[model samples]
Structure formats: C-alpha cells, structure tokens
Target: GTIGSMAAAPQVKTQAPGFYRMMLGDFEVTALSDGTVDLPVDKLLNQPPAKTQSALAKSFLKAPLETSVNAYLVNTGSKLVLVDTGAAGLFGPTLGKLAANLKAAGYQPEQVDEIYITHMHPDHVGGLMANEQAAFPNAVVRADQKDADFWLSQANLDKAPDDEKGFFQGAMASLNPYVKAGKFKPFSGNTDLVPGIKALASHGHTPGHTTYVVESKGQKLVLLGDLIHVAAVQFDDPSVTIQFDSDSKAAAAERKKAFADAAKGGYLIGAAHLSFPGIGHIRADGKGYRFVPVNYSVA
Candidate 1:
C-alpha cells in the first residue's frame, strides 16, 4: 500500500457542559457550574501566609488556586428552585457560565419557579440579572431580609468605604429589577421556602448568609453557601477563616457548628466554593473534618 499523509487535528481547548444531576429521594438535584476564578488564598486566608501555603502544598495544590463556583437546582415535581446564582460578569471573564450551563442542562431561566439566594455577595446574586433585566423573569426571588436591607440600601452604599461600595452596587444592580417587579421575597431567619426545602440561617460570611436544608423522604442534603472556601485547608481546620468573611470569628464558629452537625447527622452537603458538583459528606477526623466527595455515577 502507498504511504498516506496524516491528517492534522486541531486541539479543542474547551470543557464539556458543566452539569451533574442526581436524585435526592423523590426530588431531583442538579449542580451547575459557573466556571472558576483564580484566588490567592495564601493571602486571602486569615491564617498566616505560610500556613495556608503549607496546607495547599499538603494537598498537592498551589496558590493562586482555581476555585469552582457552583449553583444548584432542585425539582420538587411541583416547583423548580435554584440556589445561589453564580456571578455573571461581576467577578471576571472566567466566572460567569451558570445561565449557559443551565440551558445545557435542559432548563430555561423562565422555567425556574423560585430563586433562593444564600447571601447577597456578587457571586451568589449577580446571576439574577442580565443586561439590567431579570434573568429569571417568571421566578420569585427570596433571600434573607437582612441581606436585602443591607445590600440594597442606597444609604448604606453611600456610607460604605470606596473599596466596599461595589458589594452594594452589585447587589442593587442584580436585585432591583426583581424588587421593582414585585418578584422579590425576603424571608427572616429560618424559613421553609417550599415543602421539601428549608433555609437555615448560618450568617457571618455576610449579614444574611443562609444554608439550605433539603429533605425528601427522610434523605437530606444541605446547601452550604460559602461556608468553607478552601476544602484543602478549611476541611483540615475549619477554624481558619477567609477574608471574605464579614465577621471572621462568627464565620469560624458557624463553620465549626455546620461541620459538626453534618458529620454527626451523616447527610449530604453541597457547597458553593468547594469544587464543581460539591456534593459530599463530612467525616469527623480528630479535631478537624474531611470532605468525602460523591462517587461518580452515570445513572
């Protein structure tokens, strides 16, 4: 046979659609990726720079860590609830893919019946708007009233330091449209948003940071909003706090309590900043804890 020329193949440097779905009792839970942003945790962490660096090293990781920003959707058969919309153009180019991934996962923004925000941080609420319009036009947005009162306050924005004003701006820009449309609903403290979903107040990371408790047929999955930023370091010592915490002491205390509860109750957890599809279980390891990620399943 005559020798044939080899065909040249171009490398496709893109990732597959970022969505993972698993059944939680009778409910369907889907984790959607909003992409990642690189963070210098060594400096952002409240611990000594050396300690953060060493912890990352122990996990074969390094700073500037590429962190995952995750959101979740729950189908209760009666309603579709979204938790923690990912940052949309607020953070950077690398971190706004939630809407696209939601479409890829066979859902349209209009299909979402309700949106539950863990807090008013840009990453969690920025996805609420697109081009100054409500992203999920038909959805009712619910968050802790404290966050709404704090972040959406024009007076608070004026009083905020120049460096912190963007937080208020992001919140106002993303949430005002819904507020004007009468689609915004703010809850207080612990609340049951729907039959199978409940909001548990965690606070500290922000004024109204909340965790979600999803229960169906006795199975539970807790959606932790920015509870632990770095699984590598924080799982080993949750007492370590991040600069993003509005109250570092309170944040650390909440983290410890959440970790302990999850460990003892043996329920699944979905965290916003752990990794994509951050569903896992917390294992008590001595004075600290360990994260056991969900096993891969094609079904």
Candidate 2:
C-alpha cells in the first residue's frame, strides 16, 4: 500500500444545539439555551467587589464570568407554552440562540401557543421579535400588566434616564408587533395561565418580575426568571443583589423568600440565569441555600 498524506481538520468553535428535555409528570419540559454572555459580576453586583470576588473564587470562578441565559418550553399535550425568550440580537453576539435551539429541540416558533415573559428586560423579551416582527406569530404573548404599562408606555420612555432608555426601546420594539396584532395579553398579579401552569408574582428584580409554577401528576417545577444570578454567590448568600435590579432591597427580599420556599417545598426549579439546563432543587445549608442540579439522564 502507498503512504497517504493526512489532511488537518479545521476546529469547529461552535457547540451543538443547547437543549435538554425531561418529563415533569405528564408535561414535557425542555430547557433551551440562548448562548452565554460575559458579565463583570464584581462591578455588577451590589455587594463590595472584594466580597463578590471572594465568592467567585470559592466556586473556582473569576470575574467577567460567562453566564448562561436559559428559557423553558412546556408541552401539556394540548398547549405549547414557553417561558422567557432569550435575547435575540439585543444582548451582543454571545446571546441570541434561543430560536435556533428551540428548533433543534424538535419545536418551532409558530408552534408555541403562549409566551410567558418573566419581565420586560431586554435579555428576556428581546427574542420576541424576528426581523422586526413577532417571532412567535401565533403565540399569545403575556407578561405582568405592570411591566407592559411601564415598558410600553411612550410617556415612560420619554422620561426615562438616558442610560435606561434602551430598556424601554428594546421592550417596545419587541412587543409592539404583538400588541398591534392583539396578541399581547398582560395578566394581573399571580394567576393561572393554563390548567397546569400558574404565574406567581415575584416582582422587584424588575417591577413585575414573575416566576412560574408548573404542576402535573403531583410533580412541580418552578421556572425562576432572573430571581437569582450568579448562583455561585447568590445560592450561598442570596442577600446579594445585582445592579440590574430596579429595587435592590425588594429584589433581595423576593429572592430570599423564593429560595426559602423552594428549599422547604423540595420542588424542582428552573432558573433563567443559573447555568444551562438550570433545573435543580434547593436545599437549606446552615444559614445559606444550596443548588443540587438534576442528575443527567437520557430518558
């Protein structure tokens, strides 16, 4: 046999589609990724820089931490509901992968029957638009009425701080199409979005931030939207708040209450900013709380 030359293969820097599926009783829950963004937590967290740095170090992590943005899709046989849409292009190059990942997870945007936004944050609502149109054309988009009133009001946009105006712009751009189409339906307080899923008011991270409770066949999973960021620090001491919080004190209180409830109830939680496929359970550890991720399963 003659000797053959081997050709070198180029490195593929991209990852496979980021999605994970698990059955929450009879309902199907899939966690989809919107890619990741590098956040300077030392600068973004409310605590002293030294405290944030020490906490990150304890987790074998460092500043400019790469954080995951997660979304969840629930299949209740008769309905397809999505919780939080990832930042489409509004949050820079690292994010905006949710739509692609949703398709990769065996679903399509048009297939979503409803979209329950946690709040009006750019990262969470930016994916609602695709090419300046409602991405999920047939879906009824919903968020707290308070968020819709604040983010979609032209008066509020005009009076917002220069630095904060972008938030309003992003919200308006992403949600206006739905509103005009009569597909935007804002709910008040905690209410049942469907038979098995309920929105629990957990405001303060943003004025109308909300968490979802999904129950089926005696099983439950709470989808927490931006309730906790940087699990490494927050799980160990949830008193720490992020600069993005509209009301830091209130945000911290909401986080503590949610953490304590999740720990005591011993229910599953899917956090938007906890690592990808961020489904887990909370456990009380001394005065702090701990996140125990669900075991990896193929079934």
Candidate 3:
C-alpha cells in the first residue's frame, strides 16, 4: 500500500491572464480584456425570445450571453496608441478590468501616447479615469467633435430622457479630467488623427460614433468600437439592433457596410465586444456574415 504524500492541485476559481497579441504588418497590436457582461440576448436583438434562444443554443451560448468588453493597445514602432477604455466601476461588479490587463500587456497607463475613443458610451470611455484622476496622465485624448458636442453638453444632458441621462454624466466624468488637463482634443470629419491611424465616420450608434483604421507597411486592421456587440447574433443578423444605439437603423446600416468592406477587402477586425480580446475578420455568407477569429498566435 502506498500513502499519497501529494494533495491534488488546489481548486482555484480563476481565469487566465487577459491578453492576446497579433501583428498587422510590422505594427504590434495587443488586445486587453477589461471584463465581460452577461446581457440578455433578446434585449439586444429584435427577434422573438424563442428564436433568439435558438440562435444562442446553436452557438452553444447560454441564455444570458456573456459579452466581452475589450480595449486595444497598439505599438506602431514610433507611437503607442490606446483605443477605448473599459467600464471603470460604472457597470457594476462584472466589469472594469482594463487597467490591470493593460499593465499585464507590458505597458503602463502613463506610457500611452494617445487615446482615441470610438464613442462616449460609458463602457468605452469610463476607464479614462481611475480614482477620479486621469488614468493616462501622459496621453492626449482625442474623440470625434460631434461625440464631444453631444455628450459633454449640459444642455444635451438636460434634454435626455431620465434613463439616458447617466450616459451623459458618466461620459463627462471620464472626459473632464483630460479636458481640464488640456490634453483632450476633439476632431471633426474623417482624417488621419495621427500618423498611420485614420478615423472613419460611423455615426448612428451615437451622434459621432467613429471607427478607426490602422495602416502600416501596407497592412490594415479595422478597430470597430461597439460596431457589433453580440457577435453570435449580429453576424448572422445585422438587422438586429440594440436599444443603446442612438439610431438603431443607422447602426445596422453602418455595421452591414463595414461587413461588406471587410469581407471583400480581407482585413482584420478588432472589436470592443465580441469575445474577450475579440480580434477577427468578418466574412460574407450568403446575405449575412460570419466571424472568423484569429488563429492562436505564439508571436
């Protein structure tokens, strides 16, 4: 009889470190997981409950679909860029992991040279501050002028419906620190906001919702901020619109157009919500689309 001297590995409830990296030509792109939210699929899609559940089941996803919140860290050799910050204590206990994950990706918040927010939704911009201070002290934050005009105005906030008022309040809270520091700049229209990075006007989700395209050495990566939140349902049915969109119809149109362009052009996509570190490509399938996640990369 042998006596066991070793105990089984302690049962620890934890997940792996939240980070993944890939290349777009010579530029280095890292996807950092902020956290995830288990939102009701029916609430996001316009379909019937049973049908939505069926779609979820087909993808092996459960009832309350877990949506990953992500932010991208890009090192373009000469410039360091951050696209979107995560919900920082704004969306309750299920989120706000970006800061730790950013550090895990081998960079400090202060090291970010620039911050480009796709829109001012709390989930996308709330992490700009930690403990009521500028999280990225050294970074110059830029967002679309239209978004700033809509979200930062006390007048607009006053007119918002009761439920939507918090959106404006949260946006200004995160943005005010940078605005006071004189590092927050708002740009209008489509142009290269910085070298190798250009803005794409994808207005609909918000007054000035934007998409950014990163190009380097003839390679392209499209960073879509909230363009498609629930990938499993959205890819197969772009017509499904979420209530968060300022203009649901326009959001659907913008998404479908991006899908066509990405599918035809064969470009990589980095989304704020898909799965954790949601970097992939959208391919045209019949009249709809499909998501192809990037192959696991050791580089």
Candidate 2 off by > 4 Å: 1-3
Per-residue lDDT tens digits for candidate 2, residues 1-299, read 34785767889998989999999999999999999999999999988999999999999999999999999999999899999999999889989999999999999889999999999998999999988899999999999998889888999999999988999999999998899999999899999999899999999998889999999999999998999989989998989999899899989999999999999999999999999999999999988999999999888
Report the C-alpha lDDT of model 1 over 8-47, residue by residue, as the tens digit: 7889999999999989999999999999999999999998
Write candidate 3's Cα lDDT for 193-272 as tens digits.
Answer: 77889989998999899999998888899998988877777888888888788999899999999999999999988899
Instruction: Report clashes for each candidate as comma-separated counts.
Output: 0, 0, 0
Report the Cα lDDT for residue 194, model 2.
95
Listed per candidate, the RMSD to the true structure in angstroms reads 1.3, 1.4, 1.5
Query: Model 1 reaches what TM-score against the true structure?
Result: 0.98
Clashing pairs in 3: none
- TM-scores for every predicted model: 0.98, 0.97, 0.96
Stretches of model 1 off by over 4 angstroms after superposition: 1-4
Per-candidate Cα lDDT values, in order, are 0.94, 0.94, 0.88
Task: List the pairs of residues colliding in candidate 1.
Answer: none
